[PDB]
């Protein structure tokens, strides 16, 4: 059976700043020591490096996956960075400095573009499962859908969809799988959770709750939409057809569903990360941290997290601070696995033998 971990950080950080434990064990696999990870500001890059924006500061620390120590790379930003994300393929790193988005690059290290179109602070970014549309929701009730094509190839870039229906700041969103076929699920403090469409850009659902929603997450099959709350409740919306997860006592900030849509992981403000089994709304584990939870997401364990001697293939470049070929890459990866099979090192040998005999 595949190994599943649950990355969980905090905001006080007495000793560590990241505790990756096992889902069905509770045992701590890896612990990283350093600063304090800010809200919505953790994203593993390329499966070897772990970036984490600091709480209220202007720099982003970078930890190796198999070293309990901060690296000397200290990516710097010209302002109070807010939230961070990394593209799923592991090629770009996106920041949230003030009311502007900073786009970086991993293979070289340059700073390609500084987007600025929201009217108040940027609150959350996310990539649409295949790094083709990064969608940022600010604190001015706007949710914009950028395109990774038209943003990179520019001379000023413009968003592809200015979704303006909320009457209060946006808090969280969850982009689905696929490219221009996914379904974004935004949520704000106006007590509403909306499910948009990326292909056309039209509203599809406007489920309205009774408390300020602060977190939304759908399972991979889009059969449920576990919207959080501000009173502790973790609601559940059935998109295919006793639906309230109860047991919290504060805002529910971080939510994430396991692979086979059967285990929830709630991260609240009361220093607690639970583990609900979503078929009967019962709690399983109640791991308690030492401060309000900042990031908590269920993650499939990569290969680097299982080998005790793993080292990154490439070093992290010196991330630039000012605006702008020379790609740095390891060759011979597009053919990894393509080898002449057993019945091809024999057919060639037999043809050689036959030709020699004749």
């Amino acid at each position: 059976a595949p190994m599943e971990v649950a990355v969980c950080t905090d905001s006080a950080a007495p000793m560590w700043s990241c505790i990756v434990w096992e889902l069905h064990s509770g045992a701590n696999l890896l612990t990283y020591r350093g600063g304090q990870a800010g809200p919505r500001g953790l994203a593993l890059l390329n499966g070897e490096y772990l970036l984490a924006a600091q709480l209220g500061k202007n720099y982003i620390s970078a930890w190796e996956l198999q070293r309990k120590d901060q690296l000397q790379q200290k990516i710097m930003c010209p302002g109070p960075v807010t939230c961070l994300t990394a593209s799923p393929n592991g090629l770009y790193v996106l920041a949230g400095v003030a009311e502007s988005i900073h786009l970086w690059e991993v293979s070289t290290g340059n700073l390609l573009v500084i987007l600025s179109r929201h009217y108040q602070d940027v609150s959350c970014l996310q990539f649409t499962g295949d790094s083709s549309h990064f969608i940022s929701g600010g604190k001015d009730c706007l949710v914009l859908v950028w395109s990774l094509c038209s943003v990179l190839q520019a001379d000023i870039p413009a968003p592809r969809h200015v979704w303006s229906h909320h009457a209060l700041p946006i808090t969280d969103l969850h982009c689905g799988f696929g490219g221009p076929l996914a379904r974004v699920a935004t949520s704000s403090l106006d007590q509403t959770v909306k499910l948009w469409e990326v292909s056309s850009g039209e509203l599809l659902l406007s489920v309205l709750f009774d408390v300020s929603i602060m977190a939304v997450t759908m399972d991979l099959a889009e059969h449920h939409m576990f919207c959080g709350g501000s009173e502790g409740s973790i609601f559940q919306v059935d998109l295919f057809t006793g639906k309230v997860f109860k047991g919290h006592r504060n805002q529910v900030t971080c939510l994430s569903v396991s692979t086979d849509g059967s285990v929830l992981l709630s991260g609240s403000h009361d220093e607690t990360v639970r583990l609900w089994d979503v078929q009967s709304k019962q709690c399983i584990r109640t791991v308690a941290l030492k401060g309000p939870v900042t990031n908590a997401a269920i993650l499939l364990a990569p290969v680097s997290m299982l080998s005790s001697d793993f080292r990154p293939s490439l070093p992290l470049p010196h991330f630039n601070k000012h605006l702008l070929g020379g790609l740095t890459l390891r060759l011979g990866l597009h053919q990894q696995g393509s080898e002449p099979s057993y019945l091809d090192r024999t057919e060639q040998l037999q043809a050689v033998l036959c030709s020699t005999m004749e």
Partner: protein
């Protein structure tokens, strides 16, 4: 400027320049003129061809009887193939060549040195293909030639002889078809009696070659073109195939010539399987009445040949290709893997070949693990909802923990073709599920998402083309009745 000729010929052909007798008369510059001749025959307008076809044919015939080195003869034959193919369409030229030129070409082709057997057969196949009626004069000599070379040890020579000999009943048809086929199936019923004398030195090594030639000829006869309806004796062919695949290693004696016969055993079973493939390819979907025998034959052959690459890695791949072909031609009426001891045995054999198990190899057993998956995916996708829930549940517990383990030594999944087939089998399981066993969409979407972030351009492309299809099972368009 002799060596640069082929590049100039190719570049002149590419521009479409021509399509819009002097240098051939000397032994020094035969190639120099043959190149231009190849261009002119290849890319000529209809007027120039209708004018100079006879002259070019006479020149080509003249090259074949001047004791030139074999390369020149092969080039002349290659030119002659295109000449005859293009001249077979124009009616007046067709009649003229069929009346007063073809017998000379056949006589010159037959009368060649024993060092140039390949080119002679290559030209005679072209003569017999596009000009069938006019070669009936020399049928006896052609039969003798194609029959004396049908057991040659060189694989290319044997293949050419078998290809040329399979169209003998065409020159001159329905009566000549079945008459020949009832003689090949009679000769094969005799060589098997002198090769399997335990259940049914150098003489055996020739009998095996004769059997291989006479089985390849029948296989080519069953699955080629013809200009007249024929009555295929399916029952006799199936009886012969079942007799051939009946003797296993446990019946061959080990005292005397036994080791030699046992060494030759897999080749004859492979020949029988090739005959079965030809039969399935030719008859089509009309074999549902013998489908019971056909579906019982495969598990028995797999069982008699089952034991670092594993031994007997060619027979099992052939059987899996046979199963894939059988499911492909029939469709939803195949009746594979659904009920019965034979179906259960086939499922057990398929599930013990895709599961992954110092001088050695990395991708050990990487051909069997691909054919088994390519057969299983097709079988599940076509005749899906008619399989009992237990088989689908057994396959769900195997493929899902496997597609998430190959992306996290001596394993067949270190290849790329052995992983694309797995990702196709996952989609086949999703698309056609049993009515009472819902498929695991949530656990398969994650595997597909992990697939498109891979490195191989084959896996990372199929796992991205499969997400679009999977987005139709999650984002519907009409209500679920």
């Amino acid at each position: 400027s002799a060596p640069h000729l082929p590049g100039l010929m190719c570049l002149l052909r590419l521009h479409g320049s021509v399509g819009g007798n002097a240098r051939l008369s000397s032994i020094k510059t035969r190639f120099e003129g043959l190149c231009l001749l190849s261009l002119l025959v290849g890319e000529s307008p209809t007027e120039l061809f209708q004018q100079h076809c006879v002259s070019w044919l006479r020149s080509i015939q003249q090259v074949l009887q001047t004791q030139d080195p074999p390369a020149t003869m092969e080039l002349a034959v290659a030119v002659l193939r295109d000449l005859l193919r293009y001249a077979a369409q124009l009616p007046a030229l067709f009649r003229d060549i069929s009346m007063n030129h073809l017998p000379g070409l056949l006589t010159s082709l037959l009368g060649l040195r024993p060092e140039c057997e390949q080119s002679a057969l290559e030209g005679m196949k072209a003569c017999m293909t596009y000009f069938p009626r006019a070669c009936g004069s020399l049928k006896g000599k052609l039969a003798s030639f194609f029959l004396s070379r049908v057991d040659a040890l060189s694989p290319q020579l044997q293949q050419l002889a078998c290809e040329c000999y399979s169209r003998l009943p065409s020159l001159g048809h329905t009566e000549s078809w079945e008459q020949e086929l009832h003689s090949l199936l009679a000769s094969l019923h005799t060589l098997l009696g002198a090769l399997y004398e335990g259940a049914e030195a150098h003489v055996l090594l020739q009998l095996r070659q004769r059997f291989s030639g006479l089985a390849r000829c029948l296989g080519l006869m069953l699955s080629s073109e013809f200009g007249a309806p024929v009555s295929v004796p399916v029952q006799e062919i199936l009886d012969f195939i079942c007799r051939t695949l009946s003797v296993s290693s446990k019946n061959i004696s080990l005292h005397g010539d036994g080791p030699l016969r046992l060494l030759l055993l897999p080749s004859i079973h492979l020949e029988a399987l090739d005959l079965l493939s030809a039969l399935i390819l030719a008859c089509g979907s009309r074999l549902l009445r013998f489908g019971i025998l056909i579906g019982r034959l495969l598990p028995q052959v797999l069982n008699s040949w089952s034991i670092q690459e594993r031994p007997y890695s060619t027979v099992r791949t052939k059987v899996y290709a046979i199963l894939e072909l059988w499911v492909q031609v029939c469709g939803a009426s195949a009746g594979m893997l659904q009920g019965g001891a034979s179906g259960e045995a086939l499922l057990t054999h398929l599930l013990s070949d895709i599961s992954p198990p110092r001088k050695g190899d990395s991708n050990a057993n990487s051909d069997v693990c691909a054919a088994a998956l390519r057969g299983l995916s097709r079988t599940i996708l076509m005749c899906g909802p008619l399989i009992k829930e237990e088989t689908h549940r057994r396959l769900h517990d195997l493929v899902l923990p496997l597609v998430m383990g190959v992306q996290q030594g001596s394993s067949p999944y270190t290849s790329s073709r052995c992983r694309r087939e797995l990702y196709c089998l996952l989609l086949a399981l999703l698309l056609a599920p049993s009515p009472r066993c819902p498929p695991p969409l949530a656990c398969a979407l994650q595997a597909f998402s992990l697939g498109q972030r891979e490195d191989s351009l084959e896996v990372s492309s199929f796992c991205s083309e499969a997400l679009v299809t999977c987005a139709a099972l999650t984002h519907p368009r009409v209500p679920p009745l």
